[PDB]
Amino acid sequence: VEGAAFQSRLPHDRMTSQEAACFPDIISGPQQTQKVFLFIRNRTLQLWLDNPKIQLTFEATLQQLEAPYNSDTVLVHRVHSYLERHGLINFGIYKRIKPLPTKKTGKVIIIGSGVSGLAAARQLQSFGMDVTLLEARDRVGGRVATFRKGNYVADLGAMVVTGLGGNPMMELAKIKQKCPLYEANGQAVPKEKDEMVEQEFNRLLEATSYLSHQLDFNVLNNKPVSLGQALEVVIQLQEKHVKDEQIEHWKKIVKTQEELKELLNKMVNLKEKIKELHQQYKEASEVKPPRDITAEFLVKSKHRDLTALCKEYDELAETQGKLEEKLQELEANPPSDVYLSSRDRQILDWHFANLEFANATPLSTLSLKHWDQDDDFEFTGSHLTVRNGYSCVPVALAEGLDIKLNTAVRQVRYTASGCEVIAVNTRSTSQTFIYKCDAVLCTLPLGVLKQQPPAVQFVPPLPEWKTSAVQRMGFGNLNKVVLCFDRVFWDPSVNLFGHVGSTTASRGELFLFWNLYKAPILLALVAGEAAGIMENISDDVIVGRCLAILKGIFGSSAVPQPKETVVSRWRADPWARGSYSYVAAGSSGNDYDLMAQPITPGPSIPGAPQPIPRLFFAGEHTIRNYPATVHGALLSGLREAGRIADQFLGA
């Protein structure tokens, strides 16, 4: 039961803020009843999850509980209803048992038949509401978008399931997480190196986290600090401490050879002071043996004074020898010449491109403090790919539903009385449509909400607080090249392999190739600053640079001309205006929460009761904890559908 709580992103042993607000009875009450609640919940979820291919009615739930549980049966019901409302059971595609409410209640216009839309639409329809979706495209699925010619199949948007471990989600495939790199020329990268740098990359990142949290380096010049800025600062400070070592060493060489100097002096000025004595002694020793005692003394005196200074010099002569090997050692323990080579900083640049890829933006742009706020909630499990094309999901969700394709929303009008959406035909701009509804669910991409002169007018205008969050948060970019061939010329044991770019400025450019699919297809990702530029570069040139890269790596004649090519231009695509959200410098994840707060119109006649809210938001860009994924969309949808039903069908 408790790893069905986890499979539902819920704690098995505590009630959540959500549960608290729908069951204040139980959570303010005795600890015993909480356990009963929590059992019935965890169990109902387990039951749904065990067979989610078909509806779990209040009926079946009660039948398959035991013990003192189907004792209290308003509680089993209050719970089962709470779960189905918040889309924890009976969501997605399920064979209904009790067929749909005869006649419907309230009318909702959903803008977009992306996954956030479809998910909300199905829920709202399942609760007996009149739902119509308006989609500008000639298809469903939005940023889920699968190319399909012959047996060729390639996703141009989402292609990964980053974990099934508590993920609300068709043929999935593990990723062999072994990725060989290939410098500009074609030369693989010795595993020796690949590991040096991946470790340096990993350390460089933790370094920025320390630099952020411990050292509190998040502002600098009023302007806040990008992950980029922090990484450069860290790398500079590493370069500096290379030199700080280089110095303190070549400096403890000098200190040592100004001891050899000070001593080679004493040792010269003894050779001399000893030459004298040995003269003076030869001389005194002329005066021959029948001699008086003042001259036997002068002989003997000298002879003493001379075997004294001879020992003293031999003592300084082993000291000479120590100081001389001590030095010959240090002269052959040079510390590291450099922090990283050039070939190194170029492979580091690829590890940074891989980061620019996932986050779909230049690290210039990521919040140092907050880029990774979503990180505690990554799922558990193997990261997978959809072999058969992700399109299967939108399409599957769409059937049942009232979807108007080629219907571009131009204006959204929301008043105390209700809403009208004004849309047009994309195939004649001129032909106009007016949808009147109780409530509008906006799943417009953040790209579109951001369009500098608007694609869509809100009447009245979205409040400061909303538009400010839209301005603040980042909407990135990430493009793909689909390479279709007659024959499997790469290494088929290998899922993905990197290309290392010449410069920093080009680390994004066809930096990584995926083999995912049944057909002979290679995916080439453009990430970072590259993603944005290549959109303004002819299809042919791009497929050029692809084949170039591939011929250098594989042999100039194993690499055919391609049967079919596609190239994403998501920033230029006006129904997306980019790939997905990122927490920009000076944004936080709070903005994801503002993005999801619905809008409540002013009163129609002044001094009339407070209205009902009318304008609701879902989409990738509206879910703090699962931004920039399909699941996050899917959830934002289920969520809004609940918030809307709680209003227009009562809580």
Binding site: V233, L237, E239, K240, I247, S301
Partner: protein, 125 residues
Amino acid sequence: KPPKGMFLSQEDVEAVSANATAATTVLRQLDMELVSVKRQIQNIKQTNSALKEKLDGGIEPYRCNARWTTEEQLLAVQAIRKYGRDFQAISDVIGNKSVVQVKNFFVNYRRRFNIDEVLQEWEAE
């Protein structure tokens, strides 16, 4: 605290960011301090290498009984005016008297080789 083998003082961060090129000022004025200290190293090696020349050859061409003769007693007294209390020197000079026999003599005669008077002379080095 910083991951192993990264270096980040509160101090150094403030200092490599305090303007828009503190960055590559700091890196260079070390690059430059480095060549200075390499140049000092060559100079002090040349200087040292000369003195090893001056030392060529080294110093190679430059190396008991308890009955006191009168010869021996007079060698002692003189050794005293020129070694004060260095019984090892005095014994080395006299040739054939342990460092004790010196110290003894040093008292036995003391009165009649004016040895106090001898030692206040040796005071004046």
